Design a protein around this ligand. Sequence first.
Ligand SMILES: CC(C)(COP(=O)(O)OP(=O)(O)OC[C@H]1O[C@@H](n2cnc3c(N)ncnc32)[C@H](O)[C@@H]1OP(=O)(O)O)[C@@H](O)C(=O)NCCC(=O)NCCSCC(=O)NCCc1c[nH]c2ccccc12
Length: 166
Amino acid sequence: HTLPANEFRCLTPEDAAGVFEIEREAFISVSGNCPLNLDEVQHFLTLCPELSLGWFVEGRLVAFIIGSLWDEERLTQESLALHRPRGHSAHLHALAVHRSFRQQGKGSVLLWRYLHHVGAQPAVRRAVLMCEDALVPFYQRFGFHPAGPCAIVVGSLTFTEMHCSL
Ligand SMILES: CC(C)(COP(=O)(O)OP(=O)(O)OC[C@H]1O[C@@H](n2cnc3c(N)ncnc32)[C@H](O)[C@@H]1OP(=O)(O)O)[C@@H](O)C(=O)NCCC(=O)NCCSCC(=O)NCCc1c[nH]c2ccccc12
């Protein structure tokens, strides 16, 4: 009977298509590649949906974060496709906001809600991610500290690894 004006919930594999569509415009149209392809989105939403969060407006996904657990201090090429159940780090594989909903605090609201959501899970002691140099200041606003160049390479893109103690 009703499509909520705003809904925040963990994602399930049924949201994979919506997530990938956002990635097409958000990442692929810019650099030619993206953090998670359809199969990879489904992988993490199957293994660890509790490590994801999505913002729905009138029944449509407008922002998401997909993560998994990592168990090493630094991110590695292999960590891109792995979920370490025994790990203590919430690895945010991707964060994006639908192009028609940016610049209005949605990314910041979703990120803070995410940090509190996963930080609330006794097992998660830290959050890690990588971003392009221009987003470093942004993440620092949430308690993330620049942790040097990330070892992970994607095409010609280089990233700074960011760590947040929870
Ligand atoms: C960034 C985000 C989520 C903010 O949302 P919003 O617009 O709703 O945000 P707010 O309104 O809450 O705040 C906006 C703030 O963010 C700043 N900002 C936004 N875009 C900026 C930019 N390009 N450069 C500098 N500052 C910027 C604004 O300047 C502004 O600050 P000020 O107004 O105070 O200066 C939203 O713009 C978005 O979804 N963008 C596209 C996807 C993306 O990059 N995800 C983050 C990748 S970083 C995490 C990640 O996913 N890593 C994977 C790394 C990765 C793996 N494989 C790949 C393949 C290709 C590419 C990347 C990868």
